[model samples]
Target chain A: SPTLVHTLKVGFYFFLWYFFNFIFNIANKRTLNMWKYPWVLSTIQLGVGALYCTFLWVLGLRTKPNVSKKLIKALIWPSLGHTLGHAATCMSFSLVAISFTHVVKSAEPVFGAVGSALVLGEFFHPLTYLTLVPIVSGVALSAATELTFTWTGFITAMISNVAFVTRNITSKFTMVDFKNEKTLIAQNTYALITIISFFMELPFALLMEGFPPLVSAIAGVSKAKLFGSIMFCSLFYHLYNEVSYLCLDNVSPVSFSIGNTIKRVIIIFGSILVFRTPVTRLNFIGSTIAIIGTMLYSLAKAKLP
Target chain B: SPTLVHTLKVGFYFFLWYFFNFIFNIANKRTLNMWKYPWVLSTIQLGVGALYCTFLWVLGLRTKPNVSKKLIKALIWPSLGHTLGHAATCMSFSLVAISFTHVVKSAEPVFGAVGSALVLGEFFHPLTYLTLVPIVSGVALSAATELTFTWTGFITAMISNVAFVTRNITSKFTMVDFKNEKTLIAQNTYALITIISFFMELPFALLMEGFPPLVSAIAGVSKAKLFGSIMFCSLFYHLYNEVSYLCLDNVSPVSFSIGNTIKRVIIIFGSILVFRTPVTRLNFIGSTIAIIGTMLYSLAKAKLP
Candidate 1:
């Protein structure tokens, strides 16, 4: 009886995700301009995010979630992979420009292609090579443009890329046989991830940076404007990300990549105008070339439904 | 400079993954014969597996000997998703008989159709609906011989199926870009997952299960046997799985479903003999009919690949 309403709600959330993601990236970058730490900001966001759901649960706005003990075990196990990938990307972004990190992020498809080729027991076609060339060339070209190849930055981005790649592989592998009637399977997946990662990461952040000390130090003199910005941006970031994962359950990696590329284009243009992130002629050329190459990589005829 | 070799390695890994997965499925089910608790066995296996990899690093077998910060970060994230999916599948087997799970699994293509329609952003031809009917019917027929469908078991198995759907959607989403450097990319990707999951689960296992207590509790007293099983089987599992993933990256999900059906046939047959799991006449008939229908569902006028 309620399935139709739920399906519509899921779609609404999905679109909201795409919308928020676009807004968040801009807001997030601006917040970074004000308060420089991505990890701390993200950590706080996740820590606080749970309360949002809790409020809903408490208010009876949401149904009391009932997961089997077995389901919990299953959910938690995969979160290991999710947390690892997230931790890598979160930390790595701090070490490099967000744009640069996103560029390397382009490697997701290539990694997925290889993973699908190897693990899914499918056959690779010769033409797949044709597509790989431009992708590799584009990445290489972008790498060449890095004026100073700090080992830290390159390593961070590369590691982040690998972590993300593993995230995909693990997601596919773990979910190889699961069926749930959860309203938002992808959203639920992310929630499970958020819960486990909260536990997995908070401790490490505490040990490495001492969370209580850091929070107190920061909170000691929190500004009204900064606090306002952080909270607003964090909300967008949280919701946007949840939607992205939710969409992941519904779409292929390729479409996600396409959407991602388009988003990047918008971000690139937006950043140039908003933050005045200098767009060097060389950077423009490289970006143009890279975009074309990406198109080439994405150019595949349909095979099956 | 090493990019070409890396790319080929990625492709080779896919070839190996599929070939190896066949062996792994056979060996895994064999090991499962003795050990019922797959999740506990799997989680602990991560730690043992890391130690094994470290041993490889120590022996100078690994190109990057030191546990790079990037690798560690990479390892943890995907490990969450991969292991969760794996755990779900294992639990599905525990809840229901392995045979029933496999039967339901044959319907994977139907799920693939739905996911591709929803997630991958693939455009649906009018023929898509026509094509889907037989596939769904075939899968239903295959699963028709369910002797008893307890709510919990049926629901859990469905969850396992949906988890698999998400895995595919997310995997492709994550890896749609790493098409060229698929091998080192893929392996490093998997390695990242293994590492992350190791850290995430090891602590929990230690806390709840304790070190020696946890190992014994998870796989029982046959600790050495379990490790041996994973090691031996993973060699095969990794190889074939990589191949399959590579192929899948290039192929369509619908086509991948077809390949999966063939692969499952090999697995179910092997499971029957190796695990000595029973199959009723009805089950066999249902399976055959489902397979035939699956073949029909995949029925195309010409070779698409």
Candidate 2:
């Protein structure tokens, strides 16, 4: 019964983990449409999550998490990876249709495999490499056939994939040592990352978008609406991520990433509809094959003898 | 540490509950913008959820749930209420800005209290009623001063609040005895509702939009894109709900409703940014007060002696 309950709980969290991504893409895209400052938006989102977590602590709804100096030092690289990954994705949203970007993003596992081998001295079953062929080719095919494709969008999404893969690898490395030291709940991990990245991304946002355009963007629109949107996006972004980290505590990153790839199929299709992005039958076919390839990869990884 | 972990877990779920909704509204509105068939869209969302759950079960990711006949029979009425509530909210989205509809939705706790008392014989502290004054008035004031107000939008949103509150009351009534029978996981409950509601909503959609309009809507746009949007919305709608039902197991309906109100603050600001919707000073003031009122209500409820 306990096992069943645990399974049920994990299942419920997975539902949330993917469900939030499904909408996050849309919300992120909407914000990008209004403000082309991805770095500022990304910074604000991290800040909002950090502040909200702080607010919860202040309200006695949550306790201030105890973080060791060693953990904080270890988290710096992963947090930097997270900030860069997030910024790149947001930049992609500004450059291309959400569907195209996501379709291009289906290549993440390829990066993960390569990065693991090159950086982490990890190896995979040959079957895993075989699975990557269809996934990578399918995404490449989809991108090649996309009606609204752009080099910048394609490259940025790829950069995001690589950066995020790095984040995952380093996060795993940092967390393994800590797991024996103490059980850090996913929320605390995220809250800490949010705090760290908020400061990390702030300087970049200021440098890239600067205060003048930020002020002008607000003045050009209803100040309430502009600020309101930023706050909303930031809040939503933070919350989604916090929940994701909670799920991460329960599942392997392998399972989490596989589940996430399936979610991208929904996003690829949905974004096209919401934005009215043109898609050919070839594009649809390529996306379907790519998704199937990822599922195959998940299956192979799970059953590796 | 355990206490902090528990608090973090609870906070993360609440964050998920609110965050899902904040984006759900925007996503729903975006779909409605392209196609005005709310009933069909609503039906499709339920269908997509049902199908996705079925796929997960088939894939051996989730075991098939065992539900007694009695549970199915009892869920019928609440499921209908759920269907009606969903349809009305989607309708309102078609008629108004997502923020306005959510602002009006801030009045949900009032209806929850009223319905619980009148129908379920559940009464709250008088202090709860006192807190309602500002929330109710703040929404009313905001509605009165809106730049893009519409009668249909206002009325539909209000109707949605009422129907959804009724849903809360009956769902609570129906689930009480079942909690003791055996554990019914949130995923199973949601999958059941998705299956039942998919069938229930089908007829209404066909009646409202008819076969011709539905076919034409798909044909008029990129069929893949339009279908993709529907699939995405439906998938998100289903999973958000699945997670919500999971949370309901851990908290009271009243608490759930109250927590939900705070979420409206994020939406009120978020929709303005996504849609580039115009707002005035009075609009901001009213939304702020209404949100504060809800926060006070949460505080009062949490500390009731």
Candidate 3:
């Protein structure tokens, strides 16, 4: 019965998703000095984002907001975790090859599983650990094989992955309990994450990336529309993420994972083609292995009744 | 049993799969124009490639070469069709975003469904046809939404897809009849494809891209190692692709797709991060939609018992 629900509409959605996420990342980096507080940005972005949702709500439009204080509260920790993860991921983006960083960061769910075991008291099947070896070894092989791999770059990417893992696990937990908060998941999640991150990162940004001199130097470089561009990016990112989360209510987890994997194929190849990144044998090997594993995971998981 | 799979490692393998695919695309592009007999290169590559398999067989002291003449003969058309698709895909890589091309191409199954409806004498459910509309529309929408979209680029992509569809159908037919040719699949697939492409491309490359001028330009630009670089690029491409395709055979299709998807996340974000590509909410929305749709599709198709 579940025929193609909105195949025509989805790719358009993807373009929009990436577009917004792109702006968000750029803005995130630019405001390092002034709005150095990613937490604040996350919170503010969410809080203000409610304005758009409010419009959707009032226009007799959009899905009914899944309002639940318990959900809001539960979402706080993971959302905060995500805030930091976003910050780390953004910083990673600013540092390395889009392909390399992504290839490495793609391991987020693995970390999420690990986090679940430790934080959420979840357990894994014994074979899960064995299968994991190839995944790790594969990445290690890629690292060993990369023509461009550097210690610093690899480490930075790893750091980004670590941060994202934390975010993924936390958010997963939040979502597990707050399943009913579907209507405004993106808005509220982003809002909550922003608040936590603002508090966590504000002082750090001020002390590090947000020094007055650094801020002025950045401002001087392109004071005219830099701020505006950053804001636009942030806003778009907030909106698209909301849209993705919104889709969650309508679909199943298997669909979510499969959809995630396919879209990724689009972006990775897109970036390479668009940016003209250097090509290598190791890259091919890594991609094939990694992609197969991901798709397999979905199919295996999806196969369940 | 699957619960033991580490999300990170699984994701990592998927990342590698994508990375290699990208590398293969680049390598394939490098190979095509360098030699005049690219169409023939498929044959040569396939033929020569069998030698490598022979070498492996000999090293293992395996039984004498036992593949059937019937198998070899049947493979020719599919091999040629694949070559057409591969060459076209490579061309699109040079002309447009790799991700964009792949995304369009990702609807391989949709094309397969169409092909089945046409070539295989298969009568598919109407829902199957209907499902394709969204996938097709999503691609079109995504294309329209892209800041990078241009008429020429769009047309090039469409051509690439047409070739891919052809390759898919023909390959499926060949695959059906020749079940035991898995080992030869990688070697002969590329070889025949190369041979066919070489011939088809020669006149075309010469007429449009300018064969003589291309050689002359490279010669003039780099007296140091023009021919050497070209040859190296060609060989590397052939080798890389062989490795990837072989590895893909070892890996599951589900994993292949999953890795492909996750890899995109890395690459897309990485592109923006690495290239400082202009960002906007639209990109995010588009990407999110693609990702979500993929997830939805995965859930629907994959999760079905």
* RMSD (Å) of each candidate, 1 decimal: 24.7, 26.2, 17.4
- iRMSD per prediction, in order: 11.9, 28.1, 18.9
Candidate 1 residue spans exceeding 4 A from truth: A1-15, A147-149, A168-178, A182-185, A212-222, A301-305, B1-305
> Residues B24-84, candidate 1, lDDT per residue (tens digit)?
7666655565555556655655655556555665686754423456444443434565566
lDDT of 3 by residue, A211-273 (tens): 332232344556445456545656776676665554433343334334444555655666667
Name the lDDT value of residue B202 in candidate 1: 55
lDDT tens per residue, model 2, B1-305? 99999878878877887677766777777777777888888888888888998898889887676678988887787788788888888888877787888888876775665555455433334355347557755775687678768867877887777777766666676567676554456677768777898899899899888863433243466756666666766667876787777676677777767766777777777888888998889888887788788777656545652
Clash pairs detected, candidate 2: B45-B234
Q: What C-alpha lDDT does candidate 1 achieve relative to the native structure?
A: 0.57
* Residue A15 displacement in candidate 3 (angstroms): 6.1
Ranking by TM-score: 2, 1, 3
True contacts kept of 3: 0.00
TM-score result, candidate 2: 0.47
Shift of residue A231 alpha carbon in model 3, Å: 2.7
Per-model TM-score (chain A alone): 0.79, 0.89, 0.68
Q: Between the candidate structures 2 and 3, which one is better when assessed by lDDT?
A: 2
- Per TM-score, the best of the predicted structures is 2
State TM-scores per candidate.
0.45, 0.47, 0.41
